[PDB]
């Protein structure tokens with residue numbers, strides 16, 4: 001057990017191992033890690049065991065962060081608690097590499113820049129999807145980027161109704177079947193988000209900036225066309241089916257006339273991502289082999305994940321049982337090389 005030291009930073013008490021120095025608020029603090037030599041981000045969880053829902057959410061986040069080991073995905077450098085026993089356990093601290101900016105802060109992007117940024121998102125997604133994990137909240141503010149154009153996916157979907165209401169970026173990247181609760185969704189919702197991000201890097205403009213759910217759906221159907229009978233059968237809500245059928249039918253637009261001047265290979269890839277029927281969208285593994293990425297694709301350096309057991313999600317436990325499982329995962333952590 002390392003030696004811990006205490007300090008109050010902006011009305012927050014922080015008790016951390018001596019290895020972490022020069023803490024600065026950014027609750028989250030930046031620090032220097034004397035063991036690895038990295039600048040790090042330290043997150044102190046707020047009230048992690050205040051309800052059954054919150055205790056389970058804390059366990060879910062720690063299980064996910066402990067699993068992810070990939071160059072294009074956030075990973076765990078350390079996790080600790082100052083507690084010496086389960087009985088006094090109450091605080092959880094998480095540590096990762098400090099990232100300086102997100103995709104917004106960076107975004108004159110050339111076509112070569114778009115190729116490299118989207119390639120890295122897809123490489124990370126192939127890894128995440130191989131473990132049967134769905135991100136669900138891909139958007140520019142959840143992508144960290146450095147000076148060398150290297151990128152990481154973070155802030156997995158572990159959102160409220162007020163959060164998704166009106167003219168908000170929280171909704172502009174969401175697949176339509178999840179925005180309107182059309183059906184049980186799967187990992188293909190993440191490919192829709194990648195298409196929206198790619199379009200915005202190419203044009204400089206948000207692709208579907210709707211003023212509400214309905215205005216956004218109208219923008220989407222104008223580009224990709226109204227649904228046919230095949231997809232309509234897959235919408236489980238009779239209510240949503242009736243609404244869709246009230247709209248005048250529209251053909252799919254010509255993407256070469258929408259994305260004027262873009263690389264034709266980028267136009268082709270966007271057509272394969274932005275498909276209304278989620279069963280027919282290109283997968284992450286398929287997209288990495290697309291000719292747009294010929295300068296970067298290496299099938300021997302695009303790894304998959306170890307399997308990920310999510311059976312706890314269907315389990316009903318008390319607060320202290322979720323808390324004891326979390327304590328076990330804290331003390332069993334083994335750091336990366």
Ligand SMILES: COC(=O)[C@H](Cc1ccc(Br)cc1)c1ccncc1
Pocket residue numbers: 028041042043065075076094095096097098099100154155
């Ligand atoms: C928007 O993203 C954030 O605010 C996270 C906070 C965060 C810290 C540690 C862990 Br482990 C998980 C998350 C962040 C990650 C890296 N660099 C800065 C901040």
Ligand SMILES: [Cl-]
Pocket residue numbers: 002003017018019020
């Ligand atoms: Cl230490």
Ligand SMILES: [Cl-]
Pocket residue numbers: 081082083088089090091
């Ligand atoms: Cl504690």
Ligand SMILES: [Cl-]
Pocket residue numbers: 139140141142169
């Ligand atoms: Cl965003």
Ligand SMILES: [Cl-]
Pocket residue numbers: 253254255257258
């Ligand atoms: Cl057109």
Ligand SMILES: [Cl-]
Pocket residue numbers: 130131132306307308309
């Ligand atoms: Cl799995």
Ligand SMILES: [Cl-]
Pocket residue numbers: 307308309310
């Ligand atoms: Cl597992």
